[PDB]
Design a protein around this ligand. Structure first.
Ligand SMILES: Nc1ncnc2c1ncn2[C@@H]1O[C@H](COP(=O)(O)OP(=O)(O)NP(=O)(O)O)[C@@H](O)[C@H]1O
Ligand SMILES: Nc1ncnc2c1ncn2[C@@H]1O[C@H](COP(=O)(O)OP(=O)(O)NP(=O)(O)O)[C@@H](O)[C@H]1O
Lengths: 209, 15, 211, 7
């Protein structure tokens, strides 16, 4: 079993929306995936009250439930945590029990702020068990001027990113409004990027098998 | 449209 | 003097962006406006340190700075609050000392999450001192579907919502990258709505001079 | 939608 976590205190970064589509894509490939919802508002959990979900949903009553993961969700090929859109103990708890930490960030500059506090929680864990890290550009738009600013916001931290940024499309919203992922849509522009982004995520685990 | 387009990126990088 | 707050515990709700453009619209209209940033990440402040804003910018270190606003920024005409993106005491603080509360919500299902939070702290405040409130549609995209799914939510709550909304435009963002607001550019699609939305706010306090 | 009205 392995644990993937999506953390970033900033609420416009699309942590919840990403998970739904990546985990859904992860199940279609034969993997058994389980996702933990840590948001006190329980979004990934309310959405999944729509039946349609290729993954398993487990809500979090507190950080005590995010800690004992491998003791419970040990049977799944993957365990994914929908980050908490708040500066909290969550981020601290997650990194401590992960094998990969994905960090969603958007083009808007002021949306990269907390990208920092997270990157420094990993730098701490390196002392016990280095946790792999990667930046995931989401809601991308063709704004050169704006993307060079975000391209650099990453560089400094000194962590690799993903050559496959999640683009901004209306399908990523309407799909969630009904209770589906983007794989339940004719739209193939979105299914593409994710199917290639997901592939990347697995490559990180192949180098070591 | 002008003025401070880099100074933010520059610092979002520092944070 | 009157206090105004932009509180919505959710993150992509455009609180900060709204505050800037709306405040500018008010200052360039004559009034003296002072804005209090309460973000632990100081995004609005990090913004203000570059292009000169039209309003006065401040920075809070804790709720201690919010509770005393009627004292510090008393010489001003309006005090605006860029509420923290967290579910903190700031939301609790703000309402306690405000003549008006604006709740920025966006056309999405995951956004109306803690938007309901603010609504109850206002009803809870209604006991000691009635505090007005209005929802604010932001980043309005073109989807009749979602707009109603929100519009309905914005109704059950039992509060009004400005007839005008803040549309999604690459200018509202591009403008924050440089350092300007939206009135420091030729785009007249935004320069108008902000001005109209602002005229509403002025009417609200107009009915306090009437009664 | 049904849950959207709800929120
Ligand atoms: N790739 C995308 N394309 C289009 N809309 C998106 C995308 N990613 C996110 N959104 C929308 O942006 C808003 C914020 O996304 P969301 O996934 O709710 O963020 P979160 O990380 O879930 N927010 P929070 O719970 O506060 O941490 C939502 O309304 C989404 O519908
Ligand atoms: N009307 C709009 N049109 C286009 N983009 C917008 C608009 N309003 C906000 N945005 C963008 O969406 C992001 C979210 O806006 P922002 O005002 O930062 O939300 P907040 O609620 O202020 N975020 P936070 O301080 O983390 O709680 C910003 O980075 C903006 O670039």
């Amino acid at each position: 079993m392995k644990v993937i976590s999506f953390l970033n205190p900033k609420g416009g970064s699309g942590k919840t929306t990403a998970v739904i589509n990546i985990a859904t894509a992860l199940s279609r490939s034969g993997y058994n995936i389980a996702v933990v919802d840590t948001d006190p508002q329980m979004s990934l959990t309310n959405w999944s009250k729509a039946g349609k979900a290729a993954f398993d949903v487990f809500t979090a009553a507190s950080e005590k439930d995010v800690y004992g993961i491998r003791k419970d969700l040990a049977d799944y090929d993957f365990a994914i945590v929908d980050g908490a859109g708040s500066l909290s103990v969550i981020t601290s708890a997650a990194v401590m029990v992960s094998d990969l930490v994905i960090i969603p960030v958007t083009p808007s500059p002021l949306d990269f702020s907390a990208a920092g506090s997270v990157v420094t929680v990993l730098e701490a864990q390196a002392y016990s068990r280095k946790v792999e890290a990667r930046f995931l550009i989401t809601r991308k738009i063709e704004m050169a001027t704006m993307l060079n600013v975000l391209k650099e916001s990453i560089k400094d931290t000194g962590v690799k990113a993903f050559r496959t940024a999640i683009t901004q499309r209306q399908v990523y919203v309407k799909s969630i409004l009904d209770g589906d992922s983007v794989f339940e849509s004719s739209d193939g522009a979105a299914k593409g990027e994710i199917e290639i982004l997901t592939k990347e995520i697995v490559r990180i685990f192949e180098a070591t098998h | 449209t002008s003025v401070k387009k880099m100074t933010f990126g520059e610092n979002r990088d520092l944070e």
